Amino acid sequence: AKLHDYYKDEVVKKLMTEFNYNSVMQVPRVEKITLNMGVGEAIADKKLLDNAAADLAAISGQKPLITKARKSVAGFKIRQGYPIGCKVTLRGERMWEFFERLITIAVPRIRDFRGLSAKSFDGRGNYSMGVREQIIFPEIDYDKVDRVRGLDITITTTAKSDEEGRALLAAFDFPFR
Amino acid sequence: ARIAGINIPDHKHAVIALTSIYGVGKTRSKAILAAAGIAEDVKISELSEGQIDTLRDEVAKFVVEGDLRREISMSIKRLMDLGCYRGLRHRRGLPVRGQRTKTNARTRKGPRKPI
Amino acid sequence: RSLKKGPFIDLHLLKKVEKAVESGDKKPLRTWSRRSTIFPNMIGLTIAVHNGRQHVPVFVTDEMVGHKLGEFAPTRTYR
Amino acid sequence: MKKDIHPKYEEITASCSCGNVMKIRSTVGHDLNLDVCSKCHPFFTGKQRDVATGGRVDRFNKRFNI
RNA sequence: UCCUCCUAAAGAGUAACGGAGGAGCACGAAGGUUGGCUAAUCCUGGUCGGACAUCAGGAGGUUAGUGCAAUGGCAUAAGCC
RNA sequence: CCAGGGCUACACACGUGCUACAAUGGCGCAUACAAAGAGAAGCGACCUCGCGAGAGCAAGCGGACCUCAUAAAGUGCGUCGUAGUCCGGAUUGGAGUCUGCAACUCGACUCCAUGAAGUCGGAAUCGCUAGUAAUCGUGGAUCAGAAUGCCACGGUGAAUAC
RNA sequence: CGCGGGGUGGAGCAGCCUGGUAGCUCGUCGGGCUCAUAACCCGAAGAUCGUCGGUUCAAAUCCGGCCCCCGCAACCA
Ligand SMILES: [K+]
Ligand SMILES: [Mg+2]
Ligand SMILES: [Mg+2]
Ligand SMILES: [Mg+2]
Ligand SMILES: [Mg+2]
Ligand SMILES: [Mg+2]
Ligand SMILES: [Mg+2]
Ligand SMILES: [Mg+2]
Ligand SMILES: [Mg+2]
Ligand SMILES: [Mg+2]
Ligand SMILES: [Mg+2]
Ligand SMILES: [Mg+2]
Ligand SMILES: [Mg+2]
Ligand SMILES: [Mg+2]
Ligand SMILES: [Mg+2]
Ligand SMILES: [Mg+2]
Ligand SMILES: [Mg+2]
Ligand SMILES: [Mg+2]
Ligand SMILES: [Mg+2]
Ligand SMILES: [Mg+2]
Ligand SMILES: [Mg+2]
Ligand SMILES: [Mg+2]
Ligand SMILES: [Mg+2]
Ligand SMILES: [Mg+2]
Ligand SMILES: [Mg+2]
Ligand SMILES: [Mg+2]
Ligand SMILES: [Mg+2]
Ligand SMILES: [Mg+2]
Ligand SMILES: [Mg+2]
Ligand SMILES: [Mg+2]
Ligand SMILES: [Mg+2]
Ligand SMILES: [Mg+2]
Ligand SMILES: [Mg+2]
Ligand SMILES: [Mg+2]
Ligand SMILES: [Mg+2]
Ligand SMILES: [Mg+2]
Ligand SMILES: [Mg+2]
Ligand SMILES: [Mg+2]
Ligand SMILES: [Mg+2]
Ligand SMILES: [Mg+2]
Ligand SMILES: [Mg+2]
Ligand SMILES: [Mg+2]
Ligand SMILES: [Mg+2]
Ligand SMILES: [Mg+2]
Ligand SMILES: [Mg+2]
Ligand SMILES: [Mg+2]
Ligand SMILES: [Mg+2]
Ligand SMILES: [Mg+2]
Ligand SMILES: [Mg+2]
Ligand SMILES: [Mg+2]
Ligand SMILES: [Mg+2]
Ligand SMILES: [Mg+2]
Incomplete structure (x- = not known):
């Protein structure tokens, strides 16, 4: 709730002056943070996905959905309705709580973090980070995990352009290159 | 047991614990523990948290981990861009310090190949 | 590397460079002194170092300073 | 949220060596x-110290000095 | 022997050693019914992750899907949970 | 006659070595025992500067005196506890030192970081019958500089030979 | 023209008519052994399966055409 109230108390204002918005609803707001973890190696070992889910459930608050394979493909030897990855679609209250914990204490533990890519936008304000390790989040014990399976964070917003959506994140002291 | 970029050892003496940092060897590690005012015989489990924060500022003096990796990667990439004898040596995957390249050179050249 | 008592260049190459730099840019200098280091004043000159059988032109840049001239003229050709 | 299935999402105090309690x-x-x-992370100074590393001509002048 | 398309001349039917394909089962849920859903192919962006696994968006508008051939059908979906 | 370059190239194959793969071992501190040889544009103390290669000032000695020269394995305490490890120390980046007209092709050594292959080796196969094999250091010749080679020297010191 | 069967490391054979797996024996290259060669011993590579298309999540293996190849038939007047 801290970043949530920060948005309303500050930021709501800061963005109004930049793009001379007519109304307060025109300002981009952050909709959902979708944590994906396409484990993939679960074809060989079935438990390996259950280990990844335990890690996502630790990293986020809520428990992840086990995503099925959409179509069968020969390139990786998978079939229709096979559990291939994990996801969490966290939004609302716990979203802002996670979003604080991400930027404020998780990003800084990225190995040799110099600057995050400002050109990593979808052409519609929706940002996508990809973390290499789990260890960067302080929820994982060091002697528990035995495999470097990263996730990828995807911040979805209401902006109609990446330039409009950059300022939104940048206004939360987001480390860009 | 979380200083610099990585350093997470346990059941290991302090001097040998800090060798696990990239950019810190055996002699460098003794200079850290001398300046910090910590005995080399103790281990990180035995140490307290008040002492570990003094090690964090001490290793911050020296260039370590990704600061170092980039400094090395810059210097090698510099040579290759010049097109000097060392640069040609680097990109070709052959030994640089005027070494024998006929019989041995297996570390730089890699394992054996067919003809 | 060797030599703390003055970075080394041949008398003939120093006087040829000082004469070339004061006049202005012209052409590749035929030089056989590979051993000789590179000074800051040499930057801009396209001096031609002897590889063994011919002279290889080398446009001197900001980086090519601490290095020696023979480093930019491979002697043995391979493949 | 669905109760029972999720893990215990409890409040805790983060306190770094810098002094920022949170x-x-x-x-x-x-x-x-x-x-x-x-x-307290070096990105605002990091980029200043990282980019200004190169310098070959002055390095030569520091050895010769004449 | 059986089913689908044409030949078949805009009702039905209509031959040839005419032209093309299928079937001899499957299923206790792949039936019933209530409640919800909506698809291919892209283009972007994204940890390994590649031409293609998973996520996020957009553009698309049924180009899909329908236990099995084809034809006729299917959004109120007969498709998907 | 001369400047460079080359003899040091490198998909690969073999020969001869060295260093390994560790715990009878690795790294630190306490400190004991050799033999032989060398030296005048030589060998170069005590010093004093240096983290260290070394650098200045210079003692003595053509030597049973002076110097290179603390031999190292070896004890004695410590600490790591079987890990690709505090094993290995390759390979590279940076910073240097000496020699030398000159060290990039192409030297040696030093410091710092780096920390590869390697967990005892397929078919084969080699030397060795006692101060020998094994293993530790040591010196000299050629030599401005440049040994893991060569030629010598001594430490500890086995097994086995029906 | 009809009808079965084929076409896979350099050679000859399996794996092919039950869709996801490429073996065997020689030969070749490397190292041993020998005075040397052979024999012998120890390692290593070498085929996207006739070709062009389908079907399929995926084809050496299913189906269709086309190019060689064997075997069988082209009979009564
Ligand atoms: K009729
Ligand atoms: Mg280290
Ligand atoms: Mg070192
Ligand atoms: Mg050499
Ligand atoms: Mg040529
Ligand atoms: Mg009709
Ligand atoms: Mg009709
Ligand atoms: Mg009619
Ligand atoms: Mg009729
Ligand atoms: Mg039929
Ligand atoms: Mg039936
Ligand atoms: Mg049911
Ligand atoms: Mg029904
Ligand atoms: Mg539209
Ligand atoms: Mg359809
Ligand atoms: Mg159809
Ligand atoms: Mg139904
Ligand atoms: Mg339906
Ligand atoms: Mg020779
Ligand atoms: Mg060489
Ligand atoms: Mg040599
Ligand atoms: Mg040996
Ligand atoms: Mg050793
Ligand atoms: Mg030892
Ligand atoms: Mg060691
Ligand atoms: Mg050591
Ligand atoms: Mg003395
Ligand atoms: Mg002395
Ligand atoms: Mg003094
Ligand atoms: Mg001292
Ligand atoms: Mg000296
Ligand atoms: Mg000295
Ligand atoms: Mg004498
Ligand atoms: Mg003496
Ligand atoms: Mg000596
Ligand atoms: Mg003596
Ligand atoms: Mg163990
Ligand atoms: Mg390794
Ligand atoms: Mg180690
Ligand atoms: Mg290994
Ligand atoms: Mg191994
Ligand atoms: Mg042995
Ligand atoms: Mg045997
Ligand atoms: Mg030894
Ligand atoms: Mg010796
Ligand atoms: Mg001598
Ligand atoms: Mg020796
Ligand atoms: Mg085979
Ligand atoms: Mg052979
Ligand atoms: Mg063929
Ligand atoms: Mg299909
Ligand atoms: Mg296949």
Whole structure:
């Protein structure tokens, strides 16, 4: 709730002056943070996905959905309705709580973090980070995990352009290159 | 047991614990523990948290981990861009310090190949 | 590397460079002194170092300073 | 949210060596200890110190000095 | 022997050693019914992750899907949970 | 006659070595025992500067005196506890030192970081019958500089030979 | 023209008519052994399966055409 109230108390204002918005609803707001973890190696070992889910459930608050394979493909030897990855679609209250914990204490533990890519936008304000390790989040014990399976964070917003959506994140002291 | 970029050892003496940092060897590690005012015989489990924060500022003096990796990667990439004898040596995957390249050179050249 | 008592260049190459730099840019200098280091004043000159059988032109840049001239003229050709 | 199935999402106090005390809510346990934060990380100075590393001509002048 | 398309001349039917394909089962849920859903192919962006696994968006508008051939059908979906 | 370059190239194959793969071992501190040889544009103390290669000032000695020269394995305490490890120390980046007209092709050594292959080796196969094999250091010749080679020297010191 | 069967490391054979797996024996290259060669011993590579298309999540293996190849038939007047 801290970043949530920060948005309303500050930021709501800061963005109004930049793009001379007519109304307060025109300002981009952050909709959902979708944590994906396409484990993939679960074809060989079935438990390996259950280990990844335990890690996502630790990293986020809520428990992840086990995503099925959409179509069968020969390139990786998978079939229709096979559990291939994990996801969490966290939004609302716990979203802002996670979003604080991400930027404020998780990003800084990225190995040799110099600057995050400002050109990593979808052409519609929706940002996508990809973390290499789990260890960067302080929820994982060091002697528990035995495999470097990263996730990828995807911040979805209401902006109609990446330039409009950059300022939104940048206004939360987001480390860009 | 979380200083610099990585350093997470346990059941290991302090001097040998800090060798696990990239950019810190055996002699460098003794200079850290001398300046910090910590005995080399103790281990990180035995140490307290008040002492570990003094090690964090001490290793911050020296260039370590990704600061170092980039400094090395810059210097090698510099040579290759010049097109000097060392640069040609680097990109070709052959030994640089005027070494024998006929019989041995297996570390730089890699394992054996067919003809 | 060797030599703390003055970075080394041949008398003939120093006087040829000082004469070339004061006049202005012209052409590749035929030089056989590979051993000789590179000074800051040499930057801009396209001096031609002897590889063994011919002279290889080398446009001197900001980086090519601490290095020696023979480093930019491979002697043995391979493949 | 669906109760029972999720893990215990309890409040905890983050306290780094810098001095920034900070309450948060996460699935850890009792307390936390951090190295760095959004404040106190060298990215604002890091990029200043990292980019201005090159310099070959002055390095030569520092050896010869004449 | 059986089913689908044409030949078949805009009702039905209509031959040839005419032209093309299928079937001899499957299923206790792949039936019933209430409640919800909506698809291919892209283009972007994204940890390994590649031409293609998973996520996020957009553009698309049924180009899909329908236990099995084809034809006729299917959004109120007969498709998907 | 001369400047460079080359003899040091490198998909690969073999020969001869060295260093390994560790715990009878690795790294630190306490400190004991050799033999032989060398030296005048030589060998170069005590010093004093240096983290260290070394650098200045210079003692003595053409030597049973002076110097290179603390031999190292070896004890004695410590600490790591079988890990690609505090094993290995390759390979590279940076910073240097000496020699030398000159060290990039192409030297040696030093410091710092780096920390590869390698967990005892397929078919084969080699030397060795006692101060020998094994293993530790040591010196000299050629030599401005440049040994893991060569030629010598001594430490500890086995097994086995029906 | 009809009808079965074929076409896979350099050679000859399996794996092919039950869709996801490429073996065997020689030969070749490397190292041993020998005075040397052979024999012998120890390692290593070498085929996207006739070709062009389908079907399929995926084809050496299913189906269709086309190019060689064997075997069988082209009979009564
Ligand atoms: K009729
Ligand atoms: Mg280290
Ligand atoms: Mg070292
Ligand atoms: Mg050499
Ligand atoms: Mg040529
Ligand atoms: Mg009709
Ligand atoms: Mg009709
Ligand atoms: Mg009619
Ligand atoms: Mg009729
Ligand atoms: Mg039929
Ligand atoms: Mg039936
Ligand atoms: Mg049911
Ligand atoms: Mg029904
Ligand atoms: Mg539209
Ligand atoms: Mg359809
Ligand atoms: Mg159809
Ligand atoms: Mg139904
Ligand atoms: Mg339906
Ligand atoms: Mg020779
Ligand atoms: Mg060479
Ligand atoms: Mg040599
Ligand atoms: Mg040996
Ligand atoms: Mg050793
Ligand atoms: Mg030892
Ligand atoms: Mg060691
Ligand atoms: Mg050591
Ligand atoms: Mg003395
Ligand atoms: Mg002395
Ligand atoms: Mg003094
Ligand atoms: Mg001293
Ligand atoms: Mg000296
Ligand atoms: Mg000295
Ligand atoms: Mg004498
Ligand atoms: Mg003496
Ligand atoms: Mg000596
Ligand atoms: Mg003596
Ligand atoms: Mg163990
Ligand atoms: Mg390794
Ligand atoms: Mg180690
Ligand atoms: Mg290995
Ligand atoms: Mg191994
Ligand atoms: Mg042995
Ligand atoms: Mg045998
Ligand atoms: Mg030894
Ligand atoms: Mg010796
Ligand atoms: Mg001598
Ligand atoms: Mg020796
Ligand atoms: Mg085979
Ligand atoms: Mg052979
Ligand atoms: Mg062929
Ligand atoms: Mg299909
Ligand atoms: Mg196949």
